[PDB]
Amino acid sequence: SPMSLILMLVVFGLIFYFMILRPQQKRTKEHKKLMDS
Amino acid sequence: MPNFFIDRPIFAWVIAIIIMLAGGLAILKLPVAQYPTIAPPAVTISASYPGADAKTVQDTVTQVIEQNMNGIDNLMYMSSNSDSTGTVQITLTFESGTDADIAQVQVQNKLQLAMPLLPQEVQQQGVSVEKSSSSFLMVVGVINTDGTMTQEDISDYVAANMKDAISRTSGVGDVQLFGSQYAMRIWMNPNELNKFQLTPVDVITAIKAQNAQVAAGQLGGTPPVKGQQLNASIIAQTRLTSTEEFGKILLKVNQDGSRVLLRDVAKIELGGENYDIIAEFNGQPASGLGIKLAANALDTAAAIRAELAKMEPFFPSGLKIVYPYDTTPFVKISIHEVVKTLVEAIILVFLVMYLFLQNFRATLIPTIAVPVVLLGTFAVLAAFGFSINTLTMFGMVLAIGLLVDDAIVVVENVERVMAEEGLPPKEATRKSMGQIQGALVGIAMVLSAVFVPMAFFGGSTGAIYRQFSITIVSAMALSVLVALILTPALCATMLKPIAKKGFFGWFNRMFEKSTHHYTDSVGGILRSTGRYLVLYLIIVVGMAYLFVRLPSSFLPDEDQGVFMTMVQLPAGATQERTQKVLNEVTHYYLTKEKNNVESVFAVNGFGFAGRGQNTGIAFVSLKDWADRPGEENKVEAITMRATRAFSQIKDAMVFAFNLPAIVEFDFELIDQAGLGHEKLTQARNQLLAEAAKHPDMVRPNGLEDTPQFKIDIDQEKAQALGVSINDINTTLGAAWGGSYVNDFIDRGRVKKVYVMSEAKYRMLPDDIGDWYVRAADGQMVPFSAFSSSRWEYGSPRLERYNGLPSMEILGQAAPGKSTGEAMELMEQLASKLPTGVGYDWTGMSYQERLSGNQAPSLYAISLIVVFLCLAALYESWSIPFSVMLVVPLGVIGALLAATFRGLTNDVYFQVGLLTTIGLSAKNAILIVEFAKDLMDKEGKGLIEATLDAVRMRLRPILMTSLAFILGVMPLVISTGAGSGAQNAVGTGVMGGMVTATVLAIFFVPVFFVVVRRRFSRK
Amino acid sequence: QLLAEAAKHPDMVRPNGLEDTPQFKIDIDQEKAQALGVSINDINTTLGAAWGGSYVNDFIDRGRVKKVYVMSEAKYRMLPDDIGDWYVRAADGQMVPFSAFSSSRWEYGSPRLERYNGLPSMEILGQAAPGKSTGEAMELMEQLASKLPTGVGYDWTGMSYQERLSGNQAPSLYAISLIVVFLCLAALYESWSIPFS
Amino acid sequence: GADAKTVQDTVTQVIEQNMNGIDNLMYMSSNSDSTGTVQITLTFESGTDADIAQVQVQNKLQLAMPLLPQEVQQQGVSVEKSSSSFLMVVGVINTDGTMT
Amino acid sequence: GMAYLFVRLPSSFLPDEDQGVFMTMVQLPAGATQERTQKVLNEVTHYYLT
């Protein structure tokens, strides 16, 4: 059915709120790298 | 061929279009199927002996038939039932994968080679033989709208037009029916008979006499008299029709020239053949059609529904057709997901690209690099023996993500250069594919060492792992080429460089940093390795612990808008009783489950493990998914609670349950040392009872012994009176069990003519006297003049395993984990039993190697075909372990995932990690690759090389994940339509793809570096 | 009604079976039969036996098994009347004519008789030989006869059921090569724009 | 010695009706000569196992023939495949006018 | 032209290839004794040989 307007939207919204959520989890596991000390 | 196919676009394009068009056809040529033939096909010889009993039948039919099959090929295990009614069902199973056709045709003969021995009654009724498949593809039932239909007329009507109407569709099945095609019934009556000095015999005789088509040559045929000009055949007595004629039959004529009609001795009417199965639809008089099968399984179904109009008008009083059980929607509502998925995924991918390549003028590449493949994939599916089904569908869906992957993994690096070397569209795209080249191959050929290996598996399980395996291998195929001959091509045509806004296109900056932080990071972490390596193992440990802490399921308990519920009454329960207790059942659903329970096909006298007029089953059709919100409004619970409600329903056991979500524990005892049923039933006693003292919070499947009525015809006294020990036996069973006399055409159709004494005279023991036999003397005689009674126990149903007296058990230990122990008790537990009593495994139990009990066998294998395949990269040994090692990471991810989610290690899951591991392997490669390259391709630079790589390769890795990890969020949530499977899958990879990127990257530069420092140490 | 109607649109359609033939009904009168004491069996056998031929035993004829048939020689079975001729025996031990308990009467019947799919049916041979477009020749029938009673349905047998013939489908695969050829030829370096020639 | 009536109902019927489950039954034709003759021809989709396509049937015939009239069983029920009709039809004749 | 021409050409399965063989049928009225069917066959047989 013509729900592309409520789905394509879920996309723009989904992507961002999910990518950084990936990037973030990759910045902390990046800093906790303090194991160099 | 890339550097080659890149200067010639059209030949490329064109070779892709071909593959496309490989679907325009592939789609079609394909049989949509609910499920992959997942069972051992199996011949099943049905027999009957009207009015016998568990004794005779067991010994006079099952025996003359089980014993006369000395030589057959692939006899896996010969099951057996023997209903007290005449019914006999030797089912013969065969190793999953035989010539169902010859596997059965190879039998029948050995049946003929023995049937001449069967009792006349048994031959005559007709011995039967079939194959058993997915039970009832969809069960249509008929009902009267205008309250004008009998419990039998709908079966009858169904019997003349519909039943045989089955095949109006494009394709049809083996078995179907309920009810009873009409049958001329001559209910009798002892008093009148004795009056007219008549025997049931006379009747049965008077029938075969005055009613039976006769052959009568013709005038002026064969060697004529020369000169005859007229030629016409003669017509003598014919079959009977009018329910009246029969009544008008002639039984005898006394001294006053007066006659006695069959009428005068029995009520004659148009009835059914047997009155043992009454069926109801929302408690409305109704009969159905057991369409046990029917090609595009999906299309057939929809056509019986098309054929439907051919009978709407037909017959004045309602007759509205309803479809209580239909295993069809699960296809439209599956094909969809695939699409929706592909659609949502193809779109979902498009977007990512923009936030990364920001070029629309090159976001299209993938949008071609995906369908094209999933198309050709459809193709290579009909290539082999695979059907567009739910199983092979996920792969499509699953593989989709992966399928996508390659795309960018091919468009980024081919563009990475676009900025790095600032080189020209075409000139760059070559060099681009000048590296991921081999990588791409091995990478791909490597996974084939993790999906394919799994294909080749057991018997039933593998029947899916492969329906899986190749479904993804297939898709992993089109993968490289389409990504090697079309992508490189579709990329070299459209695109434009530079060796270097704000708005939301600042993003890139935010990204750059994280690139840098990664580069700045890994490098430092590298320096001091061990610190991170010891952490690796802790995880390794954890994963394991975690793993062994997760359960094992075959396949979910997938919710299907269908569910059965059973009814077993006490030995002796009249039809009435079984019905009284069925009616309650039917109530509850229509009563207290209103919001969902659409209907309730109920059938009095028919249970899957028990039969006669004690059993009963109800086909509950819940309202579709979108109309049952919450969990509690779903099957699992609707079933959970109902059975709970039933409990307090004293003096009969009842319960319901969801359907297996795929068509399919059982323990067999044997009477081997020659003992008997009684002793054998005496042992299954000690066992089922003992086994009962190790449980938390085991059962026989047969029925238990029923009271029976012994007669003992006293020969002497019998002969002293002058009565044929025949006229007796016939005059008995005849009137109490029913004889199949002649046949008669009823409105253009042949039917039976049964004779049995009307109920009134056969409800009670005493009633036996009632019956009078005739002696030569010419004077009637009571049975009682030479018969005596006495009660003893017997066995409703009776069974034997492999021509041997046996009893089945249903021992279930559902912890979920290690059932290979649950069996051990039994085999030894019962080892304390008498002599002759042996054991063995039937059904699901005999299929030793299941999924998970063997999974550990093929896995350690890929640890060969993958290590092996990956070593083929120039110089592998010493290095291989790094990619290998990357595996546990994504693994402890998928694990934690299914763990938290309270999920079990299901097949789709057993599938999952593989995908993941594929990916866990995937990315790693693309890193150790450039890593390897740099160090040799040009100047040496270990640590300084790997980082450099760990960088170049990050954007892609991250890229893909955003996609895949987005083209899976869909499935993990959903529990509305199917989805349970879509739960284990989806959740399977997210948990994987996550812990497979954040955690998996840092270690590769570690694993690889340390695996390299492992060389100069010798 | 149909074969006859279809007959009013032709230029210059037929049932394949045979048509109904005259037959001879017998009707053995049981009562009268029993009053005389003659087994309704000895009868039926003594009839068909002598008029249709029974397959009795077998016998080896010069090293080969063969049949042993019994049937009354022609002389006594050419005409209706001849039925009386035949005498059956009653328990009493005294012969009895058929005629003592048999009656005749003629009715029509059907030489050959047929049914399609276990269902009573009759075949037709509707031929429209212009040569071109027979997919129309069928349409009349299906609707033409649609004006018929109830129970009377239709369907296609033999050559007719084999819907797609050569030429009725030829146009399907042809337009195809307009793909696999255009397609194949495009593979020549740079095809598009040129292929059409 | 039967006729179009009996045969139609006492043989064709006991046999056409006792074939509830068969694979690839394209269309079941039928004739029933007034002489006893009965010819259920069973067609199958161009391309099947002529061998099993037929062996797959016979059983369902046995699963019903015990009902046929004694005369009919006895004469022997038959079953075949139909191919290019008569590859070449030889006939025999008497030269010396001595043959019946 | 081609087109017009094309659509102007008939459609046959395969020729009516000539084969040195040919059948001819004989159907008499309901009741026709063997004799009769033969009398009318004999004529048929004649014509050809005749």
Ligand SMILES: CC1(C)S[C@@H]2[C@H](NC(=O)[C@H](N)c3ccccc3)C(=O)N2[C@H]1C(=O)O
């Ligand atoms: C779907 C199939 C092609 S694979 C499956 C099974 N074949 C094997 O198990 C295989 N030989 C094997 C592998 C490992 C150890 C021992 C044996 C078999 O049989 N089935 C086929 C079929 O039924 O068509």
Ligand SMILES: CC1(C)S[C@@H]2[C@H](NC(=O)[C@H](N)c3ccccc3)C(=O)N2[C@H]1C(=O)O
């Ligand atoms: C209708 C089809 C989908 S199945 C049929 C046949 N496929 C097979 O025999 C089977 N997969 C096979 C067995 C052994 C080796 C290789 C392949 C084939 O080709 N046809 C397809 C088609 O022409 O489209």
Ligand SMILES: CC1(C)S[C@@H]2[C@H](NC(=O)[C@H](N)c3ccccc3)C(=O)N2[C@H]1C(=O)O
């Ligand atoms: C000689 C054959 C190899 S091709 C012929 C036919 N196969 C097809 O029509 C084919 N699947 C098809 C093509 C286009 C549309 C739909 C279906 C079939 O079956 N026959 C084979 C056989 O009998 O051996």
